[PDB]
């Protein structure tokens, strides 16, 4: 096979892998036999996603983001993103038993790579289906409505060589759904030509667990996603309440006219009593939480709770309009 790997899995909802760098600058025992430039290698990383889990992809940082890190390092990150870093800080350099065998200026490195050139900007909001040769970078939402997705961001600004992006897969897929993303760069070596290019690629598949779920859709009764809905869209507060359990799937869907409150639901929850936003970790920190604080859109969130989930909580998530004077919501009594 090609140099294939599966992304690492963390908890019951996190998938992660990366691409390596500086690999075409080989030792003389190889280099002296080579001429006319270096080439990319057949490395692949695969994801297999289920509804409401999160995929993380790490790539060499572009020079633009490297230079930005050098001033952004003076700023702090929030706790969720710090926890994410601890999920994804691992580098993948499996040399196995590298025993007597051949292996398999910080901005100068960025320049040396002639400005690393990976997939830019909202790495996972504009996504390529493997459906056809167009490879159109479509809104994730036009394939996976209600999906939650980050911009691409530096792994550790204090180790500003790796950047990453992530997204959350909703309950609904267009049957056999596949996406791909990729990360390229350049370099050079001790030859008579002094040029070289390198690449890495990720293939994203889905498992057979997609279905309509609970959640009280605030756009329409004829929901393509949910088995439940709330009457009307706007102008007056309307709501639902639901008894759900572990091993069941539920959520919250805002319309284009409304946005999530809690802002980072489900990582935050609305406490019915005392009318306030708290964490989905206050009493249950040992928890699979199916969302992303640094998402590009804060309108839709859902949760797929596995049978081995150990948590319990009475809480709510809501949608509010531009007038702000509303609490349109669904009360979630999870494992009530």
């Amino acid at each position: 096979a090609p140099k294939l790997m599966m992304s690492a899995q963390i908890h019951n909802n996190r998938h992660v892998c990366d691409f390596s760098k500086n690999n075409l600058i080989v030792p003389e025992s190889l280099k002296k036999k080579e001429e006319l430039g270096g080439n990319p290698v057949n490395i692949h990383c695969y994801a297999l996603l289920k509804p409401l889990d999160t995929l993380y992809v790490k790539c060499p940082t572009s020079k633009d983001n490297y230079e930005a890190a050098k001033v952004n390092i003076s700023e702090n990150d929030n706790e969720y993103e710090l926890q994410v870093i601890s999920l994804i800080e691992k580098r993948f350099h499996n040399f196995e038993t590298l025993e007597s065998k051949k292996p398999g200026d910080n901005s100068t490195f960025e320049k040396y790579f002639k400005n690393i050139k990976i997939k830019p900007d909202k790495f996972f909001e504009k996504v390529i289906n493997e459906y056809d040769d167009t490879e159109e970078e479509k809104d994730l939402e036009s394939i996976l409505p209600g999906a939650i997705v980050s911009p691409m961001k530096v792994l550790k600004k204090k180790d500003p060589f790796t950047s990453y992006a992530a997204f959350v897969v909703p309950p609904i897929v267009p049957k056999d759904l596949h996406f791909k993303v990729e990360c390229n760069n350049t370099e050079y070596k001790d030859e008579n030509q002094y040029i070289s290019g390198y690449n890495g690629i990720i293939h994203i598949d889905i498992s057979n667990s997609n279905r309509k779920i609970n959640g009280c859709d605030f756009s329409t009764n004829n929901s393509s996603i949910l088995t439940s809905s709330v009457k009307l869209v706007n102008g007056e507060t309307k709501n639902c309440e639901i008894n759900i359990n572990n091993n069941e799937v539920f959520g919250i869907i805002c319309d284009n006219e409304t946005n999530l409150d809690p802002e980072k639901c489900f990582h935050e929850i609305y406490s019915k009593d005392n009318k306030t936003v708290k964490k989905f970790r206050e009493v249950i920190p040992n928890i699979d939480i199916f969302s992303l604080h640094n998402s590009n859109k804060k309108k839709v969130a859902y949760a797929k709770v596995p049978l081995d989930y150990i948590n319990k909580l009475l809480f709510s998530c809501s949608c509010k309009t531009s007038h702000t004077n509303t609490i349109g919501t669904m009360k979630v009594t999870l494992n009530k």
Epitope: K70, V71, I73, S74, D105, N106, S107, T108, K158
Partner: antibody, heavy 118, light 105 residues
């Protein structure tokens, strides 16, 4: 609330060793470089070396690699600089300073004076 | 190692004047330069980072400029308490290195 507290002045005989400490508080010790800066009496600043306690990596200016050892205790957020085979050229104030790895030194300790003399 | 040259060990200016201090890198360091102020008996204080940004709480009269090899630290209107030694430092490449300093009188 970021604080770096350095140990007291040292008088040491030539050939002996000394171990200086820099206790950090008010930030995540393992997200930053702790470096040391040497200033001989009346002279300029010399970058001495650094440790990144998060992974243990050390970096020394070449002239100081021979005689100095930099360590860190993560549990106590304390960095240490040990000078061995002391000579008169080692008499100086040594500051510890926080920075992001390879970056600007935003917080400094008050300095520890080392005097080498018989 | 990268050499940072502050060609003037000493610099004189009156209260209320503008003064500029130069620092030249032996190779390109882009914007990876910091400037420090050290007054007698005190630890150095960070004034400018990334060649041209004022550090937190630094008074407005202090600025820095430059990118590549030539860097300038400027006091727009010197105050009497601004006497100190000013040092540039690069962190483009390890090990970090300091300029030799300029004493403002």
């Amino acid at each position: 609330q970021v604080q770096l507290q350095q140990s007291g002045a040292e008088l040491a005989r030539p050939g002996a060793s000394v171990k200086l400490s820099c206790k950090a508080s008010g930030y995540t010790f393992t997200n930053y470089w702790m470096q040391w800066v040497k200033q001989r009496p009346g002279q300029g600043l010399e970058w001495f070396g650094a440790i990144y306690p998060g992974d243990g990596d050390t970096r020394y200016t070449q002239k100081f690699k021979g005689k100095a050892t930099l360590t860190a205790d993560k549990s106590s957020s304390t960095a240490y600089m040990q000078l061995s085979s002391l000579a008169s050229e080692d008499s100086a104030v040594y500051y510890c300073a926080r920075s992001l790895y390879l970056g600007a030194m935003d917080y400094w300790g008050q300095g520890t004076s080392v005097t080498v003399s018989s | 190692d990268i050499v940072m040259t502050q060609s003037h060990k000493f610099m004189s200016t009156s209260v209320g004047d503008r003064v500029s201090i130069t620092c030249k890198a032996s190779q390109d360091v882009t914007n990876d330069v910091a400037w420090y102020q050290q007054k007698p008996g005190q630890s150095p204080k960070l004034l400018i980072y990334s060649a041209s940004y004022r550090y937190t709480g630094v008074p407005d009269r202090f600025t820095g400029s430059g990118s590549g090899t030539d860097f300038i630290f400027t006091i727009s209107s010197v105050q009497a308490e601004d006497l100190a030694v000013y040092y540039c430092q690069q962190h483009y490449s390890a090990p970090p290195t300091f300029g030799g300093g300029t004493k403002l009188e």
